[model samples]
Target: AADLDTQRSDIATLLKTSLRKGDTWYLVDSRWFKQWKKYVGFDSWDKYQMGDQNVYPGPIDNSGLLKDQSLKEHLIDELDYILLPTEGWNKLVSWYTLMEGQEPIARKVVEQGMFVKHCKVEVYLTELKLCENGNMNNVVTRRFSKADTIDTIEKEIRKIFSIPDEKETRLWNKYMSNTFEPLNKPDSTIQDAGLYQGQVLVIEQKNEDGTWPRG
Candidate 1:
């Protein structure tokens, strides 16, 4: 529980820092889905026409891959009283609507697990336009740091993938061992000292133009 608290606190600290400073960061739950989509498309109907396409299949009928009803139910059950606080959730709806070119009527089909599956965590800081009434209007944006955790995840993933070690694995492990874990789980706490999976921390600095940067 202490470790969990430490993990939560670290995440909270990162969230506050990112929000206040207008920086963005992402945390991904890597275990949420299988790699079936990574290697092959699930588009059974179009398989013959596509000719050995590797693009992940989507919009499958009633299957959890396309619409994850269970995850939404789980979130409702788990965080009924509290806000789940997911930027991923918000952007997922937007992606389905805008990028996927889906009609508004199809929004009801948006499910939590599907969102989770498609929602790779991303963060960026950009100019936010505010209206005269102090309301958010519209904005232009860019990813200041795309996939910050890639360095960490890549190390493990590459090892599993059997790629040659072309990066500093020792340094990353050392930093995690020394700085991040300790700060999150101080000696005063009774928590076990280690990093938590599926946690993200971001720090951004708001620019004069109302944009944010990692610096």
Candidate 2:
């Protein structure tokens, strides 16, 4: 938002600008744009390509972590959409990256027409038990990312346990997939479903009886 920096230009100070022309600038999402509109006038995202960008360009390293490469060759994507500055898009992606357990933040990005950043999370696999099986070994710590769906995890389970896809596969969050709540929503992202590092998720075939399956 405009002037949220202070009575002075803090971003200029941070970026060390001499108040010049012909320079690119920093940009935020529509959320902040709406905030700015309350006090000042501005255009919409579709109305102007420069709606979000500022006059000074962005920092070399965004959020004090990742570096901005500014690949001008990628200015227009294969889909024919004009790309903004790399640092601006990366900052928005970082906000999206943080939306794992933060549903409201995730919703906000979508509302503004953007995607969450993808990152891997580590989880421990349980020893999937079958009818005549007793903890068939090699249960290891597996990594899944925000892009992974419940169905993909199920397939990995099938491959790891050498079970058919039609073998009544059902995965659960803990305890060898035997708990009351199952990882039944196959289309949900692992992050959206709240899967995290060091968390336990299990997979196994169902038992004939209504009782819990075991190793």
Query: By lDDT, who's the top model here?
Result: 2
> What would the per-residue lDDT of candidate 1 be over residues 4-94, giving only the tens digit for each residue?
2333344344434423222233222222111211323223443242223343223212232223333333322112211113443333233
TM-score of structure candidate 1: 0.15
Count of steric clashes across candidates, in order: 0, 6
Candidate 2: stretches off by over 4 Å: 1-138, 175-180, 208-215
Listing every candidate in turn, what is its Cα RMSD in Å to the true structure after a full C-alpha superposition? 28.8, 18.5
| Tens digit per residue, CA lDDT, model 2, 1-215 | 33423312332233343323333444333343333333222334433333354422222222212124222232222132212233434443443232232221110111234676754444443222222133635564556665678787777767766877556756667533444356789998776676655656666676565444653
Error of 2 at 108 (Å): 21
Give the whole-model CA lDDT for all candidates, comma-separated.
Answer: 0.27, 0.44
Best by TM-score: 2
Q: List the residue pairs that clash in candidate 2.
A: 24-55, 24-56, 24-57, 25-54, 25-56, 25-57
Report the poorest 10 consecutive residues by lDDT, candidate 2: 102-111
